[PDB]
Amino acid sequence: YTRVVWCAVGPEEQKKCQQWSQQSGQNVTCATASTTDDCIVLVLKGEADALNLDGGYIYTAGKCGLVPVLAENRKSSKHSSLDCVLRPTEGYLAVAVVKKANEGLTWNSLKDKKSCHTAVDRTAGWNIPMGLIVNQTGSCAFDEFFSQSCAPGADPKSRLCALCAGDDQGLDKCVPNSKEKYYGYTGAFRCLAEDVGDVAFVKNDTVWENTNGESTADWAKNLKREDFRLLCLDGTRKPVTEAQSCHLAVAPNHAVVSRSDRAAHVEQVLLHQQALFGKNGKNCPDKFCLFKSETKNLLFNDNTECLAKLGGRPTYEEYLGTEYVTAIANLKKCSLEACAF
Ligand SMILES: *[C@@H]1O[C@H](CO)[C@@H](O[C@@H]2O[C@H](CO)[C@@H](O)[C@H](O)[C@H]2NC(C)=O)[C@H](O)[C@H]1NC(C)=O
Ligand SMILES: *[C@@H]1O[C@H](CO)[C@@H](O[C@@H]2O[C@H](CO)[C@@H](O)[C@H](O)[C@H]2NC(C)=O)[C@H](O)[C@H]1NC(C)=O
Ligand SMILES: CC1(C)Cc2c(-c3ccccc3)c(-c3ccc(Cl)cc3)c(CC(=O)O)n2C1
Numbered sequence: 267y268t269r270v271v272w273c274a275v276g277p278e279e280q281k282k283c284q285q286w287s288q289q290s291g292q293n294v295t296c297a298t299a300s301t302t303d304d305c306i307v308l309v310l311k312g313e314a315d316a317l318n319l320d321g322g323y324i325y326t327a328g329k330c331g332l333v334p335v336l337a338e339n340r341k342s343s344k345h346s347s348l349d350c351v352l353r354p355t356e357g358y359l360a361v362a363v364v365k366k367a368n369e370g371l372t373w374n375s376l377k378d379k380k381s382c383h384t385a386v387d388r389t390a391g392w393n394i395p396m397g398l399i400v401n402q403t404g405s406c407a408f409d410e411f412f413s414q415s416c417a418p419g420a421d422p423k424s425r426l427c428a429l430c431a432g433d434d435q436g437l438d439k440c441v442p443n444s445k446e447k448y449y450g451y452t453g454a455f456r457c458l459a460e461d462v463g464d465v466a467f468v469k470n471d472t473v474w475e476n477t478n479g480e481s482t483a484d485w486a487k488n489l490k491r492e493d494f495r496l497l498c499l500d501g502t503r504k505p506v507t508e509a510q511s512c513h514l515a516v517a518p519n520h521a522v523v524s525r526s527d528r529a530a531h532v533e534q535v536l537l538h539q540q541a542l543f544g545k546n547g548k549n550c551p552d553k554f555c556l557f558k559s560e561t562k563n564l565l566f567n568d569n570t571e572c573l574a575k576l577g578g579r580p581t582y583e584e585y586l587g588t589e590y591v592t593a594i595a596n597l598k599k600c601s602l603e604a605c606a607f
C-alpha cells in the first residue's frame with residue numbers, strides 16, 4: 267500500500283499523470299487540483315501524497331509541515347563522475363529577459379513597463395524580482411510598479427493579470443496552471459517573445475530551450491537568441507550567453523515535497539519510477555517519459571535529468587537556504603509565521 271498519489275496541477279498535468287499511472291500499473295495514481303496551493307492542501311489533508319514544486323511554493327508547503335524529498339537535477343559540467351541521483355544540485359539562474367530591439371530598457375527603467383511572470387509566489391518569476399523591486403523602491407506597492415503584467419495567481423481584474431490571455435477559448439485568464447497561455451517559464455517567455463510584455467522573469471535555461479530551433483512550437487520556432495538581452499542588476503544589458511554574470515539570483519532547484527510521515531515511501535517509489543521512466547529509463551522513450559511533455563514542463567521541468575537525493579535530510583529552510591527564506595519572509599510582509607491554510 268505504497269501506492270503514491272501524485273497531485274497534478276490543472277488538466278494537462280492530470281492527463282500526463284493519468285498516462286504515468288496507467289504505465290506504472292497504478293503504483294502511482296493521480297489527484298488533481300486547479301492550483302499549486304490547492305494541491306498542497308490535498309497533501310496536507312492526506313488526499314494526495316506528493317508533487318514537485320518551485321522553491322517559492324516549497325516555502326508555502328514547508329510552513330505547513332511538508333518536507334523536501336528529492337530535487338530535480340539537470341545536466342552539469344563538473345562533478346561528472348557522480349551518478350545523477352547522487353550529484354549535488356547546482357541551482358538555476360533567475361534572469362530578467364528583454365528584446366534587443368527594445369533599446370535603453372534596463373533594470374533601472376523598468377517602472378511602468380509591461381511584465382511577464384511565471385506565477386505569483388514562484389522564485390524567478392516573482393519572489394526574486396518583486397523582492398528586489400520592493401527593496402529598491404522602498405515601497406510595498408509592487409502591484410503599481412509595472413503598468414500591466416501577466417502574473418498568474420493575482421486578482422484577474424487587476425493590472426497584474428491584464429496581460430494574461432487564458433486558454434484558447436479565452437477562459438481561465440490568469441489562473442496559475444498551464445491552461446493560461448502565459449503561465450510558467452515557457453508562458454512568461456512566450457509573453458515576451460510575442461511582445462505582450464517588455465520584460466519576462468524566468469530562468470537562464472528557458473531562453474536557451476525556446477530559441478535557435480531548440481523548440482519547434484509555433485510561437486518559438488523562429489526565435490533567435492541574438493534578439494534577446496538579459497538585464498543586469500548594475501544597469502547594463504548583456505547577451506544571453508552571459509547569464510553567469512548577469513542574473514538576479516541563483517534559485518534552489520524545484521523539488522518533490524510530501525508529508526513527513528510519507529516521505530520515505532514517496533522517495534523509494536520515485537526512485538523506482540525514474541529507473542523505469544526517467545532519462546535513460548527502461549521504458550523511456552519506449553512507453554512513457556516522466557521528464558518529457560513537449561516543452562510544457564508538466565509535473566517536472568522537461569530539462570530534468572533525474573530526481574536526486576538530498577544531502578543532510580534537510581528541512582525546507584535548509585533546502586531553500588536561509589537567505590532565500592528571509593527574502594521571502596520580507597516580501598510577504600507587503601501583503602506571523604503560521605501555515606497559510
Ligand atoms: C543556461 O542555460 C542553457 C540551457 O540549459 C545552458 O546551456 C546548456 O549547457 C550545457 C553545458 O553545460 C550544454 O551541453 C547544453 O547543450 C546547453 N544547452 C543548449 C540548448 O545550448 C547554459 O550552460 C546555461 N548557462 C549558464 C551560465 O548557466
Ligand atoms: C530585501 O531587503 C531585506 C532587508 O534588507 C533583505 O533582508 C535581509 O537579508 C540579509 C541577507 O540575507 C540578512 O542579513 C538580513 O537579516 C535580512 N533582513 C531582514 C530585516 O530580515 C532581503 O534579503 C532583500 N530581498 C532581496 C530579494 O534581496
Ligand atoms: C542544495 C541547495 C538547495 C541549497 C543551496 C544554496 C544554499 C544553502 C544554504 C546556504 C546558502 C546557500 C544555494 C546558493 C548558491 C549560490 C548562491 Cl549566490 C545562493 C544560493 C543553492 C544553489 C546552488 O546550488 O548553488 N542551493 C541548492
Ligand SMILES: *[C@@H]1O[C@H](CO)[C@@H](O)[C@H](O)[C@H]1NC(C)=O
Pocket residue numbers: 289290291293542
Ligand atoms: C509496481 O510496484 C511493485 C512494488 O514495488 C513492484 O514490484 C513493481 O515493479 C511496480 N511496477 C510498476 C510497473 O511500476
Ligand SMILES: [Fe+3]
Pocket residue numbers: 320321388389390391517520
Ligand atoms: Fe522556479
Ligand SMILES: [Zn+2]
Pocket residue numbers: 513515516
Ligand atoms: Zn550570482
Ligand SMILES: [Zn+2]
Pocket residue numbers: 578579580581584
Ligand atoms: Zn539539517
